[PDB]
Design a protein around this ligand. Structure first.
Ligand SMILES: [Ca+2]
Ligand SMILES: [Ca+2]
Ligand SMILES: [Ca+2]
Ligand SMILES: [Ca+2]
Lengths: 338, 338
């Protein structure tokens, strides 16, 4: 009954499609509406909706253009919007202390960390996240007397790993030397001898001293399929063989579920690994001034900064098995193993 | 240096291979050893090791035959075993109140649930699990004013779903009628009208009233790739279209990570869905007398029953996207879409 049925959703979804190439579903819109029922704060709406930020903005713009939301007092539904949610039955969106010494020691050290710099795309997690990560990895048996490779470390996970006393050895690669220098200084104050800084071109083949030498890697790659395949491809190639662990963050803030599907296909068909854990909002990022640089910032006439750490990622854990593989050499443009 | 290096692990792993066809890795053994360092209770060793029960038993038998463990006082390392773990550097394995009305009401109802029967392969989760599941599904936006299909319900999730008041409607299929009768009686005492019992042959094509009619399905399938492809294939076919949710349990107790890899490949390449959540030990099963029916029971001369709920599964959440698909018709022997 196309003649009498509500054409509201379809109308909204078609308008969203003129604003973004991210796949738009009716539920993308419902997710945002559900978030708006819970909160008039745009950062929280993005958080609660678990849709990528540019899709949320495009959805909020479309709903505004069509009379469903106003930005005059945070983000709120109009009466037309209140009628929309009622019609479609859209509900309001509902949502470490044993290692307390580690956390105190970690905060003590990183209070003087080098300033995050836009030049190095530096966004890092809270001290509570870092320490929870260590605990989590320990509960999976991936730390104690193990060899850890930390690919990029603006989170300063290597410091928390050293403070734990658990790993046999740790190797860290980071493009920002202020970090590696700080890590080495920290290692000295901690008395942790078995720290190495790797400095090599990630574009070029892995060197023998990083090829198949680690039990566990951890990394937090940029949010593109191309960067993930490079960072995880390279991390897996640093792993000794079967039954080694990889840890990395993937966000709903910047990657759609269609993009997640491609990532997971990469993992299983390209790298032929298994996913043991996908833990929602495990990673909480310290506000670094990212909000003000987004389109969301321009959306609400009165500017308001995030009240809390709205930017979060899921923790993925992967494990190698017989036949797993990474990229030892040149990183390819397309899938080569699949 | 094959001539002087410890041949201990390789020896153990070769002996394990004569006892099981489950893929055996050196880390399978390390995982068990790490668990034995934590606990002399076989149920807890299985739990902590996160290896499948028959592999754990085969590993413990092999370690015993080779002088590394004794079963004379729970499971303990011998001096030779203590030397083995020291040599390989194996560490000891380390490891709802806002809805309190729901939980009280749920316990009140299910205290008189029908007795679990071996005839129907009935093993169910704790009341705390069931209620946590409802909360979890609600936090992902999959319950409120939604249509839920419960494929098999020895957990009595439908009762907790009804007590929540959240779903538009609920449909339940279960081979044990004592359950469906109880669910209908419960519905009446709760005042929940929108419950339907489905009774159809799952082997045969889905009927029109269950084909593409639901927003969310939940199921707890048997632990074989063949049963998972049948239960999830069928659940996905009950889903309306894109952006619908499926929930199901997968255990480390009975499926190896190599089996997980096949399952995840099924999900992404057969059904072309995305995995949004893999939550370790989310499901806690009530001890149903399964332990006494296992080989583990025969392993320790003095018989001891589990002290706690040692049998746990991970919660998987999947979401359909454009191009997802299930099995509407005959369930195939092999992959048909991949
Ligand atoms: Ca970072
Ligand atoms: Ca080792
Ligand atoms: Ca069951
Ligand atoms: Ca709906």
């Amino acid at each position: 009954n196309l003649y009498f049925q509500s054409n509201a959703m379809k109308e909204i979804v078609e308008r969203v499609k003129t604003k973004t190439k991210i796949p738009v579903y009716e539920r993308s819109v419902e997710n945002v509406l559900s978030a708006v029922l819970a909160s008039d704060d745009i950062w929280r709406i993005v958080d609660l909706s678990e849709e990528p930020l540019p899709l949320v903005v495009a959805i909020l713009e479309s709903l505004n253009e069509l009379g469903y939301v106003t930005f005059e007092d945070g983000v709120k539904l109009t009466e037309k919007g209140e009628e929309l949610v009622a019609e479609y039955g859209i509900g309001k969106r509902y949502d470490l202390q044993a290692f307390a010494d580690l956390l105190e020691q970690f905060r003590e050290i990183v209070k003087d960390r080098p300033e995050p710099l836009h030049e190095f795309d530096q966004a890092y997690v809270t001290p509570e996240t870092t320490v929870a990560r260590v605990i989590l990895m320990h509960t999976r048996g991936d730390l104690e007397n193990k060899d850890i490779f930390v690919l990029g470390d603006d989170d300063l996970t290597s410091i928390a790993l050293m403070l734990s006393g658990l790993p046999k050895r740790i190797a860290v690669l980071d493009i920002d030397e202020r970090l590696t220098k700080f890590i080495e200084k920290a290692a000295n104050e901690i008395g942790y001898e078995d720290i190495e800084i790797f400095t090599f071109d990630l574009r070029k083949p892995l060197p023998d001293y990083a090829l198949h030498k680690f039990d566990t890697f951890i990394t937090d790659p940029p949010e593109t399929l191309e960067a993930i395949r490079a960072f995880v491809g390279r991390g897996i190639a640093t792993l000794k063989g079967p039954r080694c662990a990889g840890y990395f963050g993937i966000t709903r803030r910047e990657s759609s579920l269609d993009k997640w599907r491609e990532i997971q296909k990469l993992l299983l068909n390209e790298f032929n690994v298994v996913i043991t854990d996908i833990i929602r909002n495990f990673n909480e990022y310290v506000n670094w001034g990212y909000a003000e640089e987004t389109r969301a910032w321009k959306l609400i006439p009165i500017k308001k900064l995030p009240e809390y750490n709205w930017y979060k990622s899921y923790m993925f854990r992967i494990e190698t098995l017989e036949g797993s593989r990474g990229y030892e050499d040149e990183i390819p443009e397309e899938d080569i193993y699949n």
